[PDB]
């Protein structure tokens, strides 16, 4: 897109390692206003994902939300099915949702089920498998407490999982937020990446890092800043 929008690509210097505070400033005045863009974080970790023990996988709890509709599907029966619809989930399925999903309907983001309900969802997980919509018991989605997990989807749980070529991908919030509020969701994630640092990782753990919107180019950020995101 060598276009007139590339005047927004002239402010960001490619050899200037900015701060997480000035990353959110350049995030606003790079994105246009006709789309309500989303600010992204791309981290190139120093892990070798060929070995299984160096697999950075985990979640986060963003303390300021993300600005997302957060469509929830819940596999539950009984009062568990009525607790999820009282929590604020629009689609609270049941055992009949076996038929509705495999017929070509996957209009939800994250699944929540009891371990009793998972007996009949995992056979349908052939199509929920590679899409990441499958229930994962480490992120609280397969448990008895199916009530607080619904609000935490609205609370801003983001599932980060490193790819095959050692890259992280992570959203921090919409471009209608403040500059001081993006860096509070940003600094709450690097704190949760370093917790899930593998113990057998050679070299510098957070090598190159960059922040961009849905349309704007990259903004180089400083890896040495791990404490002063305020």
């Amino acid at each position: 897109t060598s276009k007139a929008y590339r005047a927004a690509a002239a402010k960001v210097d490619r050899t200037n390692l900015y701060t997480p505070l000035q990353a959110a400033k350049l995030a606003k005045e790079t994105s246009s206003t006709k789309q309500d863009a989303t600010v992204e974080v791309a981290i190139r970790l120093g892990v070798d994902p060929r070995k299984a023990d160096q697999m950075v996988r985990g979640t986060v709890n963003l303390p300021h939300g993300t600005g997302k509709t957060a469509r929830v599907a819940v596999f539950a029966v009984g009062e568990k099915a009525d607790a999820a619809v009282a929590a604020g989930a629009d689609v609270v399925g049941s055992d009949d949702l076996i038929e509705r999903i495999q017929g070509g309907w996957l209009e939800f983001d994250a699944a929540i089920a009891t371990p009793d309900q998972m007996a009949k969802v995992g056979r349908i997980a052939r199509v929920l498998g590679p899409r990441g919509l499958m229930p994962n018991p480490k992120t609280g989605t397969v448990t008895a407490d199916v009530a607080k997990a619904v609000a935490d989807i609205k609370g801003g749980k983001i599932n980060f999982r490193v790819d095959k070529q050692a890259n992280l991908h992570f959203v921090i919030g919409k471009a209608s937020f403040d500059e001081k509020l993006l860096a509070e969701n940003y600094g709450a994630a690097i704190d949760e990446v370093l917790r899930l640092k593998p113990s057998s990782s050679k070299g510098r753990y957070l090598k190159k890092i960059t922040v961009s919107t849905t349309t704007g180019p990259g903004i180089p950020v400083d890896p040495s800043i791990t404490r002063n995101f305020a």
């Binding site: 998972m118 990441g132 397969v142």
Partner: protein, 547 residues
């Protein structure tokens, strides 16, 4: 660039025949190495070190961390289950029992306690996203349509010779290891499957070692060429037309260096017998140099090559084989339909066809081990055949190579003549104390050579050879085709070596089946080069195997 395999000061020797002596080399990813050398050099013993099967005598031949290794042996094994179950034992080996555990916990965790089994269906589910095994069914349904495998629900006993190699190539090419070890991958395959394996091994992340004797598979898959001489390994780059130059040059300078060493002995042996004159003494320094030059003239005897010599049979008459409207089939599938030919006298008939079309069943109607469905075969009273199957008796893996040619006897009948058995196996290369090697430790170039010793002692005048150009190097492959031209009977040869049927053939029988018939053959009076010209007067996208 972090390596895949390294060797450090490795020396492996079977006593007097060394295979390695102080070798050191590294294999980095993206290498395309084709390893060559004559029979007895040690090519299949090097690849069994790199697979973790064998171990060297001394030295340290280890592997990089991670970096799983898959080997294709020169005679690949199979199980006794179906073809669809034959491919899941490698490539889907460890990952099917994770799939056979995740469906187990889909009903076991419901009727049991859901706190320890919660993570047991969790860390399985973390091993289904980076390996992408949710659609493991259709990953098998692609890898069979790439090699064009036989169908799923049949046993692996009544398969071809090339269908048993198509089903073994699908095992290793599903694993995708970081170090392939292909020991003769193009045996028993047709021209369609070798052309497939050229384009597949081009784009392949990982090291490829491939020992081949042919010259056209190697120039498409290999850019670096490793050699195995008497112990030593000589890596360089080229395209096998420069291998035969440099191999014939090492023997050129060695021939006129051992000859110069020989004339230094006769001038020195004349000194040590000259007799000491008056009180001056013969010097003990020069006696010691002669006794060390005589020893280095004995570790150089390398010339031992005998031509393959086919015994002549009795006089052959005018009717050799007559075939009148032959039909052969095992099921509703038909292989041969309305075939009429008559084998000539004093010629070579080449049989042409792709895999699984009925070339070996055609020989088993002539020898009578099968039975025609309709129509007859007629032999003729002067014809005495010579043929041994690859599967009904073959060889015995703990009888020695002397008592497989013989049966424990001293002199044998090769057809109305008496020759000694040890003078007969020594005419086929097996000389000295190598005549006590059992059949399990014989290599592929001396199992094909043993199989010619069993067929040709029957003294026939109609020899039937099913792929004699199998694991033979260019020195004895030219020696075999020399003896098929000095043969006064009829020889019928099934082969896939296109540049062996172009050289010694006089008549071509070829499968020309198409969609409406699929079982018609064709008799041609002439050589293979003129059959290709007559083929066009009568009258593709590479399948991916992965994603």
């Amino acid at each position: 660039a972090e390596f895949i395999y390294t060797m450090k000061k490795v020396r492996k020797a079977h006593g007097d025949k060394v295979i390695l002596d102080d070798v050191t080399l590294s294999f980095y990813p993206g290498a395309k190495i084709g390893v060559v050398g004559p029979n007895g050099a040690g090519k299949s013993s090097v690849l069994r070190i790199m697979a973790g099967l064998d171990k060297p005598n001394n030295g340290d031949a280890f592997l990089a961390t991670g970096a799983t290794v898959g080997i294709l042996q020169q005679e690949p094994p199979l199980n006794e289950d179906k073809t669809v179950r034959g491919n899941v034992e490698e490539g889907m080996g460890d990952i099917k029992i994770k799939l056979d555990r995740f469906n187990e916990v889909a009903e076991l965790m419901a009727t049991d306690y859901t706190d320890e089994l919660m993570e047991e269906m969790g860390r399985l589910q973390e091993e289904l996203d980076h390996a992408d095994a949710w659609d493991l069914d259709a990953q098998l349904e692609q890898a069979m349509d790439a090699l064009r495998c036989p169908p799923a629900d049949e046993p692996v006993t009544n398969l071809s010779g090339g269908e048993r190699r198509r089903v073994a190539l699908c095992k290793l090419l599903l694993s995708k290891p970081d170090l392939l070890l292909l020991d003769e991958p193009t045996n028993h395959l047709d021209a369609e499957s070798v052309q497939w394996l050229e384009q597949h091994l081009a784009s392949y992340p990982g090291a490829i070692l491939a020992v081949t004797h042919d010259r056209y598979f190697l120039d498409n898959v290999a850019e670096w060429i490793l050699e195995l001489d008497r112990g030593r390994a000589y890596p360089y780059e080229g395209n096998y037309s420069t291998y035969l130059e440099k191999k014939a040059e090492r023997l050129a300078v060695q021939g006129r260096k051992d000859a110069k060493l020989q004339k230094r002995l006769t001038e020195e042996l004349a000194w040590v017998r000259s007799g000491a004159k008056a009180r001056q003494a013969k010097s003990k320094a020069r006696l010691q140099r002669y006794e060390e030059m005589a020893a280095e003239a004995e570790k150089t005897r390398k010339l031992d090559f005998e031509e393959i010599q086919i015994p002549v049979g009795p006089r052959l008459g005018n009717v050799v084989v007559e075939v009148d409207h032959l039909d052969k089939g095992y099921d509703g599938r038909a292989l041969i339909k309305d075939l009429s030919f008559s084998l000539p006298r004093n010629g070579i008939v080449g049989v042409i066809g792709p895999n699984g079309v009925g070339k070996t069943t055609l020989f088993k109607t002539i020898v009578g081990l099968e039975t025609p469905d309709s129509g007859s075969v007629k032999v003729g009273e002067t014809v005495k055949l010579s043929y041994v199957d690859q599967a009904r008796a073959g060889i015995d893996p703990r009888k020695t190579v002397w008592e497989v040619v013989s049966d424990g006897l001293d002199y044998i009948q090769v057809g109305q003549t008496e020759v000694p058995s040890r003078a007969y196996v020594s005419a086929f290369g097996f000389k000295g104390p190598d005549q006590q090697k059992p059949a399990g430790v014989l290599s592929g170039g001396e199992r094909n050579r043993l199989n010619l010793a069993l067929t040709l002692k029957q003294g026939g005048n109609l020899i039937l050879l099913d792929e004699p150009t199998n694991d033979l190097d260019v020195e004895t492959l030219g020696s075999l085709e020399n003896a098929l031209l000095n043969f006064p009977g009829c020889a019928v040869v099934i082969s896939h070596d296109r540049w062996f049927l172009d050289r010694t053939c006089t008549h071509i029988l070829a499968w020309e089946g198409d969609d409406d018939n699929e079982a018609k053959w064709f008799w041609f009076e002439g050589n293979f080069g003129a059959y290709e010209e007559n083929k066009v007067e009568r009258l593709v996208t590479h399948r991916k195997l992965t994603r």
